[PDB]
Amino acid sequence: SPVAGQKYDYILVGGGTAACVLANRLSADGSKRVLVLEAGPDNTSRDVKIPAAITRLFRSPLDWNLFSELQEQLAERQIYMARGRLLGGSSATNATLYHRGAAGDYDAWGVEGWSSEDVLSWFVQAETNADFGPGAYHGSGGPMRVENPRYTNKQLHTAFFKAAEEVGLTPNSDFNDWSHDHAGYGTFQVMQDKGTRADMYRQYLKPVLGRRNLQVLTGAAVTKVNIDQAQALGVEFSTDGPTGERLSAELAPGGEVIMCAGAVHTPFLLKHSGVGPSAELKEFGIPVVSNLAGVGQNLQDQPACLTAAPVKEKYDGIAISDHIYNEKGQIRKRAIASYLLGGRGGLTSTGCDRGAFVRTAGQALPDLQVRFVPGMALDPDGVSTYVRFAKFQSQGLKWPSGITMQLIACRPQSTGSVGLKSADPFAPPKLSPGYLTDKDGADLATLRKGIHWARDVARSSALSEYLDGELFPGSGVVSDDQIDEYIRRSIHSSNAITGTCKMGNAGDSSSVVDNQLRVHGVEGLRVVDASVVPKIPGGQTGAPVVMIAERAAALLTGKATIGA
Ligand SMILES: Cc1cc2nc3c(=O)[nH]c(=O)nc-3n(C[C@H](O)[C@H](O)[C@H](O)COP(=O)(O)OP(=O)(O)OC[C@H]3O[C@@H](n4cnc5c(N)ncnc54)[C@H](O)[C@@H]3O)c2cc1C
Ligand SMILES: CCCCCCCCCCCCCCCCCC(=O)O
Ligand SMILES: CCCCCCCCCCCCCCCCC
């Protein structure tokens, strides 16, 4: 009905991070008709604009509310896996940390045309940085906005840095400068524009919505790609949930469907379209169009656990919880004024934007990311404690002042999977993060050693000044076995999720797409989202997604080639 009688040069399945970049670059010259189908609503929420309102976005109507299958290795728990559901996707709901990982992360992909030297100019093209001028590693002029965080906790941020120096870690002045080693302590840059979230809807899509050749539908759930026998024809979707009429948007001759539904929903939708392991499709009576074993395999996510400690009574009130709430759970006037007057102060913080990358045991690249928060977790699950913090508003209670260190396995060895639980394309996917399943126990050892590192930092003179005991994991958790059980019971997502539609070289039979991002065995079908990442880089995954989307757009518009 909104597509009746229309023919599209490009149909984007999803209106998230990658889709926003592609909708912008593909519609640019006026010659191509682009459709974007997003299941979620328009991006208008003030909870998206204000970085600290990340707390409110978890388990909200702007999230998919996904839970994993029971995880026998994690004390028989389902794991919550946050995912954005609105224009901008997970860029509209993420912690805004700007990370590329190390050059060695892209070289480890072993994909022709996607080496560290190949990708660097695509990160640089995307970037405008408030704190780094143009150079080998930074651009000026791209649509992204990156800056140093405009909240600083004067006591606790500097005490973390001095504590890290004291235990023997060195400062890293730029975690995205590939000329120096990734390890070290310091400040994470953020995808913000003077303290407001600079998500890919705001930076790429919203400024071009006036273009005649670009049509964006929200509340549009894709149910499958229509494939002829194997040639993509377009896509089926409902604008009215499960009971809605299945509409079909149709490709023009020479047109392409681009999958932009992310590392959870892209392999889910491929499987519903007959692209996936034939046994999984047959289970639910889906005809096999392309028997690709790797669809939904190779799920990489970075698992987390945390430590937390209160400050001494004399330091009551110095935490970011004290900067955002008064002692009855009212948003502080000073925080609202600082945010509106100059884009500064606690409401500009997602909390976890200072930290470190650490080698626990002489690895080629750091295995551990630490995120320091100048506020105290009240749950060993940091995502649950952010939900608690949002729900705390107006309860008339005082959040106790302290700190948290979140420990992340940033280059994990474990893998999981996404598949089907049902023939219904509106049902949730069958999701397994597979945390701590790697044969050598390397991911558990990383997090155990992370806990030891966080305790070494909290014990240093610099932080000892402020701290008064330890809340998590606490005095009952000391031996290796006690720590390992604490990790099993508290492990949560740091919200990466990549690699479920892996790009590969010629002759890599685990791959779903080639180095041109084309799905094996289907014409006119590509994947441009985190699904394609062969091996997860260290650090958060949003900037690498934007880099892939920029380079894919340059490929599709004929401004660049891949391989030569
Ligand atoms: C809570 C959280 C915290 C994070 N923290 C950070 C961080 O600090 N920094 C960082 O760089 N990265 C972070 N990440 C990761 C980063 O945001 C993602 O890796 C990145 O945004 C993924 O982009 P994408 O295009 O692959 O997918 P998404 O941005 O998730 O886009 C997928 C889109 O597809 C839509 N969709 C799904 N199914 C359908 C369907 N059937 N029909 C139509 N549309 C559909 C979704 O609603 C969504 O809008 C975070 C992620 C989250 C969720
Ligand atoms: C932990 C809770 C997070 C708090 C987030 C909400 C704070 C509300 C402050 C009062 C409203 C702020 C003014 C409106 C600004 C809207 C955002 C923007 O347009 O940049
Ligand atoms: C966005 C401002 C939040 C302040 C919250 C105070 C409590 C601190 C808890 C940190 C929790 C663990 C690490 C971060 C989890 C990130 C989702």
**Domain of residue 98, CATH code:** 3.50.50.60
Asked if residue 225 and residue 373 are part of one domain, the reply reads no
> Which residues, at least 6 apart from 508, have a Cβ–Cβ distance to it below 8 Å?
502
- Nearest-5° angle of CA 226, CA 231, CA 237? 15
Q: Token digits for 410?
A: 């940033």
CB 215 within 8 A of CB 36: yes
Last residue of a domain, one of 475, 490, 505: 490
Pick from 553, 140, 53: nearest CA to 346: 53
Output helix, strand, coil percentages for the chain, rounded to the nearest 5. 30, 20, 50
CA–centroid distance, 86 to ligand 1, in Å, is 9
Asked if residue 154 and residue 249 are part of one domain, the reply reads no
Q: How far apart are CA 381 and CA 63, in angstroms?
A: 18
Asked if residue 503 and residue 481 are part of one domain, the reply reads no
C-beta 106 within 6 A of ligand 3: no
Asked if residue 505 and residue 474 are part of one domain, the reply reads no
Q: Taking the mean position of all CA atoms in its chain, how far away is CA 231? A: 31
Asked if residue 343 and residue 223 are part of one domain, the reply reads no
Q: How far apart are CA 275 and CA 281, in angstroms?
A: 8
Is 221 within the bounds of a domain?
Answer: yes
User: Which residue has 């958060």 as its token pair?
Assistant: 540
Asked if residue 98 and residue 26 are part of one domain, the reply reads yes
Q: How far apart are CA 362 and CA 57, in angstroms?
A: 38
Query: Does the annotation list 371 as a binding residue?
Result: yes
In eight-state DSSP terms, residue 142 is: S
Asked if residue 204 and residue 128 are part of one domain, the reply reads yes
Query: Does the annotation list 326 as a binding residue?
Result: no
- Nearest-5° angle of CA 216, CA 220, CA 223? 130
Asked if residue 5 and residue 91 are part of one domain, the reply reads yes
Asked if residue 269 and residue 232 are part of one domain, the reply reads yes
Q: What phi and psi values does residue 49 have, to the nearest 5 degrees?
A: -75, -35
Q: What's the total number of domains in the chain? A: 2
Is 226 within the bounds of a domain?
Answer: yes
The residues that bridge with 525 in the sheet, in sequence order, are 257
CA–centroid distance, 61 to ligand 2, in Å, is 18
Find the CATH number of the domain harbouring 378. 3.30.410.40
Is 381 within the bounds of a domain?
Answer: yes
Ligand nearest the Cα atom of residue 195: 2
Q: How far apart are CA 502 and CA 511, in angstroms?
A: 5
Ligand nearest the Cα atom of residue 545: 1
Is 426 within the bounds of a domain?
Answer: no
Q: How far apart are CA 385 and CA 486, in angstroms?
A: 16
> Which residues, at least 6 apart from 465, have a Cβ–Cβ distance to it below 8 Å?
159
- Which residue, judged by its Cα, is nearest atom 11 of ligand 2? 336
Containing domain of residue 112, as a range?
A: 1-148+188-297+497-564
Pick from 155, 177, 169: nearest CA to 355: 169
Resolution in A: 1.8
Is 431 within the bounds of a domain?
Answer: no
Instruction: Name the 3-class secondary structure at 445.
Output: helix
Q: Where are the beta strands (DSSP E) in 314-401?
A: 354-358, 368-373
Q: Token digits for 233?
A: 């024809």
What Cα–Cα distance (Å) separates residue 433 from each residue in 122, 152, 355, 386? 29, 34, 24, 21
Query: Does the annotation list 298 as a binding residue?
Result: no
The residues that bridge with 406 in the sheet, in sequence order, are 306, 371
Q: How far apart are CA 314 and CA 345, in angstroms?
A: 22
Asked if residue 34 and residue 121 are part of one domain, the reply reads yes
Last residue of a domain, one of 490, 507, 525: 490
* Technique of determination: X-ray
Is 125 within the bounds of a domain?
Answer: yes
Q: How far apart are CA 213 and CA 8, in angstroms?
A: 9
Give the torsion sign (CA, 449, 451, 456, 457).
positive
Asked if residue 224 and residue 80 are part of one domain, the reply reads yes
Asked if residue 238 and residue 139 are part of one domain, the reply reads yes
Is 427 within the bounds of a domain?
Answer: no
Q: How far apart are CA 225 and CA 248, in angstroms?
A: 9
> Which residues, at least 6 apart from 539, have a Cβ–Cβ distance to it below 8 Å?
97, 99, 100, 101, 175, 357, 369, 410
Is 430 within the bounds of a domain?
Answer: no
Instruction: Name the 3-class secondary structure at 396.
Output: coil
